[PDB]
Amino acid sequence: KVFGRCELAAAMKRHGLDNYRGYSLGNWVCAAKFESNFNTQATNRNTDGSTDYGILQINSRWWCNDGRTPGSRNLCNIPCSALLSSDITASVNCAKKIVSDGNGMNAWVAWRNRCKGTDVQAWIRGCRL
């Protein structure tokens, strides 16, 4: 599923991401835009053999099991394929664990390079929330 901007904002708000660990909703929408272009089916392979999955490009090196990342962890206790669903619940719940692990949203490279320090409220401007 390719979300619209306001559609995704509303879904993330319903799932408790607005101001989660102090990160306003626009931070999460901005991260999703630049990580996946709002596409739940996005995958990308990393140099070390791990793979990033879904709307927030969660990495199999630490967070999910895809059966092809030897020596990795599965800290969200999910198969990576669950992060590709049209229902974003699994991605949001895993993202909550990630952002709570000490480094905040700096875990998302695209957030750090394209969202951090910008006017992220623009990503939810005009949306009915």
- Enzyme catalytic residues: 35, 52
Return the one option of Cl ion, Na ion, none that residue 93 interacts with (CB less than 5 to 8 A, by type): none
Contact 8, 127 (CB under 8 A): no
From the annotation, which residues make up the binding site? 101
> Which residues in this chain contact Na ion in the complex, by CB under 5 A?
60, 65, 69, 72, 74
CB of 34 to Cl ion, least distance (A): 10
Alpha-carbon span 89 to 101, nearest angstrom: 19
Three-state DSSP at 58 gives strand
CB of 27 to Cl ion, least distance (A): 6
Binding-site members for substrate are: 101
Nearer to Na ion, 40 or 51 (CB): 51
Residues that bind Cl ion (CB under 5 A): 5, 24-26, 69, 87, 104, 121
CB 63, CB 75: distance < 8 Å? yes
> Do residues 123 and 9 lie in contact, with contact meaning Cβ atoms separated by under 8 Å?
yes
Q: How far is the CB of 10 from Cl ion (least distance, A)?
A: 10
**What span, in angstroms and rounded, lies between the C-alpha atoms of 27 and 115?**
7
